[PDB]
Ligand SMILES: NC(=O)N[C@@H](CC(=O)O)C(=O)O
Ligand SMILES: N[C@@H](CC(=O)O)C(=O)O
């Protein structure tokens with residue numbers, strides 16, 4: 001439509017990493033996501049992907065990611081074939097490759113989540129249709145990064161210039177890896193606080209490939225093992241994560257007394273006690289809204305890929 | 308069309324938690340709407356009333372009828388289902404009930420929840436922006452079973468006022484009989500209710516006491532029995548029986564009474580010519596297969612009514 | 627302008643339990659219809675033929691191709707699927723098979739049933755109002771597999787009559803080879819069938835005897851071996867090999883042992899050097915090491931294209947049953 005033009009660059013293409021997107025890619029998707037959101041909240045009913053099929057291939061469990069993918073597909077008028085791993089012909093000795101080839105025979109796109117990092121590369125090698133990396137081990141989670149970025153944009157108004165805190169298990173947290181990559185390559189970030197005990201800090205295999213962009217844009221990088229008052233007062237985003245002593249990163253109503261008036265708290269979810277329920281009532285808690293921005297970002301993605 | 312399938316306005320955008328929330332007029336509007344739903348589906352007509360709306364099942368215990376009929380009802384309105392699991396979720400990585408509700412709520416137009424705890428429903432409500440349809444909360448209620456059950460009685464017998472009905476089996480833990488007693492007693496002039504169970508599994512006081520005014524104003528007879536006596540067999544228009552749901556004395560009393568509360572072809576010889584056997588299902592041997600060929604065996608038709616009655620509910624909720 | 631999708635009339639309103647219930651004419655008609663399904667779906671066209679119709683899977687043992695393929699096919703006709711799970715259902719409270727059939731039959735227009743008991747499909751039939759498609763009954767039959775297997779031979783080789791076909795591997799428990807042998811011998815002029823299997827896993831007498839009349843009357847040569855001889859490799863137009871059906875205890879052990887121990891049935895690039903230029907390798911799937919990944923590059927490897935054929939054969943089956 002004039003109203004919902006797909007993002008041309010994403011057509012017919014798998015999504016494995018946040019590295020594959022340009023700054024233009026992200027904003028085209030953001031604006032497309034906002035258009036999708038306005039049409040849906042009005043009660044408009046899209047038939048954009050009628051006759052098209054997504055198949056989830058989840059070798060690890062998910063609540064959100066599965067559900068937001070499916071809902072996104074459906075709200076575009078597309079369909080889902082409900083493949084399960086536990087009740088499948090994997091049990092009879094079949095291999096990942098043959099499994100992938102199989103669902104490929106029937107589908108227009110695959111959404112894959114897997115505990116091994118290099119499993120996705122293997123899926124690409126045998127797949128004809130697009131695969132969307134919905135999480136590869138401790139590797140990446142690219143579409144979360146995109147929707148995270150939509151959230152920041154939509155809530156605060158700009159992504160350029162922000163100071164962001166990445167909190168929790170940065171070592172194994174695939175969300176924070178895609179997010180860092182996405183933000184630093186495609187925006188001008190003031191400062192990034194990496195908040196974690198040393199054991200779970202942001203890995204070098206993430207930081208080093210970003211170093212040129214970090215340096216060239218003059219982005220500040222500080223490591224702390226705590227949510228110190230400096231982190232609380234300066235951050236426009238507190239993005240915190242699950243584990244995969246804890247007092248020094250927990251965010252509660254009290255801690256929130258030190259935050260600015262114009263900032264948000266975000267969490268890819270699910271959460272443990274790092275993010276107290278005391279916070280939920282605060283208009284700065286955007287971690288529930290995040291999931292709805294998720295659905296619309298995923299509509300944008302699916303449409304752009306399959307248009 | 309609003310001529311053919313007028314939704315039931317009172318149900319617009321509201322959660323369904325109890326049989327207590329409905330009025331007589333509500334139950335009748337839903338009955339007539341379900342029957343109209345049925346006449347269309349049976350004639351091959353396709354409906355598109357709910358294109359682009361999503362129903363998410365949220366089932367923490369097993370189901371065959373209620374899951375499936377809900378999914379089928381939604382599809383037959385042209386709506387969609389997101390097949391969310393609890394066993395294949397991030398509830399494994401330490402996620403709580405409210406967070407789970409707030410999640411599915413981001414995506415859905417209506418939620419359908421079955422949960423082993425009674426209070427699990429009131430907890431979900433407090434955080435949900437979208438209607439939740441209670442598909443069973445522990446041993447509490449199963450309000451939409453009560454509605455399809457009442458649909459069954461009405462379509463098969465022709466009237467609900469004036470009936471004698473026996474509720475049979477595990478009445479303690481049977482959320483089906485809790486909701487069905489409340490809905491009939493509160494909204495119809497029931498002649499007699501037989502409560503057929505051993506003491507250990509009798510109908511709970513917390514169901515019966517809230518009904519005392521209805522019971523006295525409408526003059527309903529309530530008799531407890533521990534057996535399907537000849538009286539109960541000869542006088543009942545509806546025999547509605549239930550599985551025994553699996554502390555020590557309950558097991559035993561159930562063992563002591565099982566043959567007395569079992570319905571089989573032999574027992575049906577004492578039944579009226581016009582009456583019905585019902586069972587929300589699933590069943591064990593409290594209801595013999597020997598009864599399945601009898602015209603009064605209404606427990607299979609019962610399921611189909613469920614789909615059509617849930618079509619009426621879904622459409623009225625989301626109109 | 628476009629192709630018609632006439633339903634195959636004789637399938638209307640009927641259960642599919644066995645390869646035996648099909649005539650040659652039904653097979654070609656379904657084949658042709660599946661090809662027109664193919665050309666429509668691959669052209670991007672959106673089918674709305676079975677809107678408002680419901681398919682319910684009633685799988686009492688694992689499946690990937692078959693479950694997924696049926697759901698896809700239903701979706702691509704404009705139909706819908708109620709994702710009922712046997713393992714997470716009221717059977718875990720003692721519900722019978724029949725009550726479970728009657729349950730889903732209450733909501734569905736068609737049931738796709740797979741079950742480890744040979745006779746369970748029979749149980750199901752006796753109570754279901756709506757058609758049931760047998761998607762696997764123990765070690766019995768797998769009749770939609772046979773139909774797609776035949777599609778795959780037709781589209782790939784150009785003819786089914788006149789072919790020499792090897793059925794290899796676990797022929798005793800292999801429901802797929804059971805239905806396919808029956809379906810080929812009763813409706814086509816097969817030149818020769820090689821039965822490549824160790825003695826313990828050979829093709830059973832309860833499949834071979836009912837076909838005796840047909841085999842003799844039509845001159846169908848039948849050769850048993852326990853190895854992929856050079857003869858078998860050199861003469862065969864189709865190498866349809868199969869997985870050892872482990873899921874199906876001391877003769878049991880010797881039967882498991884026999885596949886690779888009294889073997890020589892592995893197919894790999896080395897064995898393939900001996901094959902015709904014009905031939906195909908098929909495997910209904912999943913595979914184990916009987917079908918090496920070294921064959922996958924070979925254009926003669928048809929076992930992936932087979933799963934695609936199968937979706938289209940299945941769209942054809944479902945439209946014909948439900949139109
Ligand atoms: N976004 C998700 O779907 N989950 C995250 C967050 C987490 O699981 O901790 C992940 O690690 O994949
Ligand atoms: N399934 C119904 C009745 C039963 O289980 O026997 C319920 O649990 O409400």
Ligand SMILES: N[C@@H](CC(=O)O)C(=O)O
Pocket residue numbers: 762768801802869871910911912
């Ligand atoms: N998948 C096929 C073959 C096999 O399982 O080996 C069947 O179920 O019969």
